[PDB]
Symmetry: C3
Subunit: 286 residues, 3 copies
């Protein structure tokens, strides 16, 4: 196997961009669920469709979406992906994570990723948001790691570490940032596990994941994080718990995608603003 992209394809995509917009972003954001809004919270908004951008993964089947939106979020220069790629759609991971490498070349130095995810910790509840303190990359154990293949020294090392992937500073700020707006639910913290999907977990599987010590489960994110870290970026992210994963044979409920888009609307602005004020914590460039 081999990454389809050549070092220089990344550079070409970046420069293109570096010259079709005045913006120079510092924070990349990958939503999410609605986030929805954040496109409005932005200001100075300049949109591109993925389809216009050299090399950008070709999202394949319409529906899709596919806008890079650059602008300013709470006094930070931002670029946000509305719609992402997933392994379950058929993309090899070096396509799923291509944007991340573009972002680093645009000058970006922090990455914020968010997602919807099923709650595995029985303590959680629908609507909680969970801060990501660590992950379990199950696909990665078997081979599906977006770094598989020859390493490009210009991006990072052959064997990078992930033990510190979720910036401790940013996690503190966020827990602080959240109490100083006081809320009826606390900010949650824990381990995200990625599985590949696209079908949802059985009860026994859900039990496996709890045993492994996962608190939440979803189908993305982890690869983008690994590539972000390989690159140098500072990374921080979290999960809107959109559903309690099932957990015993009694219950007559199942997990669906109605509930995920629905819930994504309950917290539509809860997060819209969370992320937005979070911006003020993220350091600045020298």
């Amino acid at each position: 196997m081999e990454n389809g992209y050549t070092y220089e394809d990344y550079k070409n995509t970046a420069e293109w961009l570096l010259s079709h917009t005045k913006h120079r972003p510092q924070v990349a954001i990958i939503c999410g669920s609605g986030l929805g809004g954040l496109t409005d919270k932005l200001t100075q908004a300049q949109i591109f469709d993925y389809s216009e951008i050299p090399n950008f993964p070709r999202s394949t089947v319409p529906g899709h979406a596919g806008r890079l939106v650059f602008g300013f979020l709470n006094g930070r220069a931002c670029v946000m992906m509305q719609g992402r790629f997933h392994m379950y759609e058929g993309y090899p991971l070096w396509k799923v994570t291509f944007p991340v490498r573009v972002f680093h070349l645009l000058g970006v130095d922090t990455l914020v990723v968010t997602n919807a995810a099923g709650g595995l910790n029985p303590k959680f509840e629908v609507g909680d948001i969970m801060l990501i303190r660590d992950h379990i990359n199950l696909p990665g154990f078997s081979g599906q790691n977006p770094l598989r293949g020859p390493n490009d020294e210009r991006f990072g090392d052959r064997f990078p570490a992930m033990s510190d992937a979720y910036d401790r500073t940013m996690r503190q700020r966020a827990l602080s940032t959240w109490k100083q707006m006081g809320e009826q639910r606390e900010l949650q913290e824990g381990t995200y596990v990625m599985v590949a999907g696209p079908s949802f977990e059985t009860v026994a599987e859900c039990r496996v994941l709890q045993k492994l010590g996962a608190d939440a489960v979803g189908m993305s994110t982890v690869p983008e994080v690994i590539v972000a870290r390989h690159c140098g970026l500072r990374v921080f992210g979290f999960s809107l718990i959109t559903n309690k994963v099932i957990m015993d044979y009694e219950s007559l409920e199942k997990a669906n995608d109605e509930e995920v888009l629905a819930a994504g609307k309950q917290a539509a602005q809860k997060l819209e603003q969370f992320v937005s004020i979070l911006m003020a914590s993220i350091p600045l460039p020298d």
Copy 2:
């Protein structure tokens, strides 16, 4: 990655069939181990080789077999696969599970799958049959899920649920159906875990699988079930425990395929008739 088959390839395979046999099956059965017999228990039997059928995965290396057999089993219209495809043979999962999609288009609305499997629960013994109440789809965690790729809305949703994959009704009937023939061994019930093979588990691996809460382990089935569910079918199945998986370093025994084909002959008719009377439980069409 991409499914090699186009929506219309399925339709073409079905129609072909829908016109080379008078039968219209309602129950698909995928054996199994011998089952062997069931070809005889059938009546009105019309055979096809896979090799004659448009698009049917090309089983590759002779030995193989490869007969679709249509007919009547205990007053149900049935179609049965004698010999199946496996991931360990090299087939992508969208080939392994192609027949299942054909069956749905033939009008079939229930699927019965069976297999041989190693016992992980120490309580089980060689010869038991285990009813499948749930699965752990380890390949699926990493990417090897037969639904990976663009979803075809005409078959099912993008994110289907598997928490209820093994029809509770059918499981009751079967446990009942079995006591009303009274036996010296009970019907067993539990979790099937799929691993990809083709080599057999080490002791440490066997220990991993017990810890995860699996009761039996084999190399198939799960994908066909996921595709069956994605499609609407009612699904029910089980495992002939052909061997006790090893479990500690003391023992001087290993797992082989002699014992699997051998044992498959001990229960040759035990199941031959089990499945056969089971037919009478499965509802009917309106």
Copy 3:
């Protein structure tokens, strides 16, 4: 999927070799870490680069290395791979394990493999060497098993067993061989788990692996062992624990590849000689 090599490609590579060197090895050794030295400990040393050898996986990117070195180690006819292939580099497993099949055709009947690996057992310490008593083949669970595809009856069975992969005799000799040179650290024994890499584990992942009962973790070896066993070879191996895998969020240390090459030099000769005297235990040919 399909193995790229044809039965006869193996034969062609072997014969070539069987006629460009006088040596006829009995023991294949796959290092390792430095082992470094063993090239010197050899005598009668005849080197080939992989690049000169028909069919030998093309190591792709220079740096690489790539010497088969034949000769005599402590009165055994040996062939040793300096540098190996890994799944994380992009090679399909049927390339990673190609040499092993060549070795069997050269007449070789034992295989010794060694590697660097992170310690998961808290009892271990940097510098220990761990004897491999068993493995957990996580990639194998999902599909990445070097035997996937049509089986070639001339090498081995379709469904071979791995429960006895690590020769009990050889393990005894080694534990004995080691006490009769008395040391301040004991020889360690346990389970090696393979993960695919190339990035290092998170804390949560490390915790998963302990729970599964792994004592050490690395990114290779297991596939070569499975192919060795499929073939008939006697197999024995171990791990230089080059680093203690991290294990809790407190610690401010990470895993790197400095430490792995460094430590590989601490034990440079500790193992250089261990393997070397080990030679005297391995039986002989009739």
